[PDB]
Design a protein around this ligand. Structure first.
Ligand SMILES: *[C@@H]1O[C@H](CO[C@@H]2O[C@@H](C)[C@@H](O)[C@@H](O)[C@@H]2O)[C@@H](O[C@H]2O[C@H](CO)[C@@H](O[C@@H]3O[C@H](CO[C@@H]4O[C@H](CO)[C@@H](O)[C@H](O)[C@@H]4O[C@@H]4O[C@H](CO)[C@@H](O)[C@H](O)[C@H]4NC(C)=O)[C@@H](O)[C@H](O)[C@@H]3O)[C@H](O)[C@H]2NC(C)=O)[C@H](O)[C@H]1NC(C)=O
Ligand SMILES: *[C@@H]1O[C@H](CO[C@@H]2O[C@@H](C)[C@@H](O)[C@@H](O)[C@@H]2O)[C@@H](O[C@H]2O[C@H](CO)[C@@H](O[C@@H]3O[C@H](CO[C@@H]4O[C@H](CO)[C@@H](O)[C@H](O)[C@@H]4O[C@@H]4O[C@H](CO)[C@@H](O)[C@H](O)[C@H]4NC(C)=O)[C@@H](O)[C@H](O)[C@@H]3O)[C@H](O)[C@H]2NC(C)=O)[C@H](O)[C@H]1NC(C)=O
Lengths: 206, 206
């Protein structure tokens, strides 16, 4: 039997508008004694209930059980600790797994937008690059936009640990050299802990 | 018993000046019957010898054995297949693991150098960004330089799979806003399969 505990989605914890949850999963649960008890403690105090919810699932020749605890945005950011205590009769003692947002002195990220290279103009499409760096923790999110709709073609690299214990990352928005020379403006959006409203925007235009 | 087979170092396979090797490792080797036989086959034909070399190692309460086959640069790039056949008397049948450079139609990467943002000038240091994209396979390498010495402060992100099955990546060289305004020139170096000499260089300067 194994118990995997999962953290909320970065973007959920950063917008009060959303809902962030912590997912506790259990695998290899005796096909014989499938009964399973879950315990949830925030910082140390059980919330067993706290609108916590699961449901059985027969798999392998074994069973799988998911439990989901809804978290409070400020609770998560203010670094509360969450614990999942799974107990089963076909198990010696129960298993406990804890989790909490990445600990550490927060750093406000610096967002830089860079136009395409003077050389990439040869090509039909061009790259709009967003340099985001100096942030901590890693939990971050970046999206592009041209107006009341989000640009579709763009990939963002994962966070890379820099030399100053801080992370950086680039996001690259592919756009038809046309839309770019025409004059349109694109925006690099960033939702991070250390931002004023956990949010910020940087513009880009011919 | 487990057998892990490792590929050469990207940068070794790209410079005839270097030496590339394939490393076969074995773990959990009966502390009782430690005798171990290794077989190496290139494309299918054994090279057992081919200047292949190993040496015992007592660990855990078990044993660990490393074997190293030297490879031919063109052999590796031209996609030859390498197989490691480890046999032991305390094992039913022997174990075989094979490996070969990442298969697939090669793509010449496009290298773009971008100066720091008009906004990052506020800061004491600045970022020189090298956009490398459109390459395949991932096996790649990027280094910075200012003259007869390689710049020390710079991190490169891992390869990110784009929307066109091709990879891209950014490299960021931190430099004192001084050295940059003074007039120095920095160079983004790239060693990739699909490059003329598996190499190319792009410059950057005020
Ligand atoms: C017995 O069978 C199990 C199921 O395997 C099945 O076999 C295949 C052929 C199909 O028939 C499928 O039905 C199924 O794959 C064997 O695998 C199980 O155990 C392994 C580890 O031993 C586990 O891998 C771990 O995955 C972790 C990340 O995924 C989370 O873990 C559970 C484990 O069951 C996964 O099912 C979930 O994906 C889970 O992720 C969360 O899922 C919930 C519910 O959907 C979501 O709400 C969350 O958002 C999501 N969180 C995330 C990922 O953000 C990983 O961290 C860890 O390192 C392992 O890699 C398999 O996931 C699990 N099988 C599955 C996919 O159900 C099992 O090994 C067999 N028995 C033995 C011999 O162990
Ligand atoms: C019994 O003990 C083993 C050793 O553990 C020891 O315990 C600690 C407390 C210390 O006392 C140390 O002495 C040592 O860590 C247990 O671990 C061993 O097995 C695991 C997997 O079960 C293995 O992890 C795998 O690592 C892979 C990558 O590393 C390669 O694999 C071997 C495995 O032994 C490693 O030793 C090497 O790092 C190897 O990498 C290559 O190494 C050679 C030789 O140095 C180099 O020439 C190559 O350049 C290098 N190639 C690379 C990495 O590019 C990984 O792919 C895989 O997914 C696993 O994660 C451990 O590495 C191995 N222990 C070590 C580090 O020696 C073992 O599990 C115990 N028995 C049991 C119950 O399995």
């Amino acid at each position: 039997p194994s118990v995997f505990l999962f953290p909320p989605k970065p973007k959920d914890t950063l917008m009060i508008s959303r809902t962030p949850e912590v997912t506790c999963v259990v695998v290899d649960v005796s096909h014989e004694d499938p009964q399973v008890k879950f315990n949830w403690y925030v910082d140390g105090v059980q919330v067993h209930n706290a609108k916590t919810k699961p449901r059985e699932q027969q798999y392998n020749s074994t069973y799988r059980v998911v439990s989901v605890l809804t978290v409070l945005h400020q609770n998560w950011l203010d670094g509360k600790e969450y614990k999942c205590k799974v107990s089963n009769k076909a198990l010696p003692a129960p298993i406990e797994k804890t989790i909490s947002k990445a600990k550490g002195q927060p750093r406000e990220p610096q967002v830089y937008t860079l136009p395409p290279s003077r050389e990439e103009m040869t090509k039909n499409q061009v790259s709009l690059t967003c340099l985001v760096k100096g942030f901590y923790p890693s939990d971050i999110a970046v999206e592009w936009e041209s107006n009341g709709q989000p640009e579709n073609n763009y990939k963002t690299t994962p966070p890379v640990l820099d030399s100053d214990g801080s992370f950086f990352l680039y996001s690259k928005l592919t756009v038809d050299k046309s839309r770019w020379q025409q004059g349109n403006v694109f925006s690099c959006s960033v939702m991070h802990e250390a931002l004023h409203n956990h949010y910020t925007q940087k513009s880009l235009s011919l």
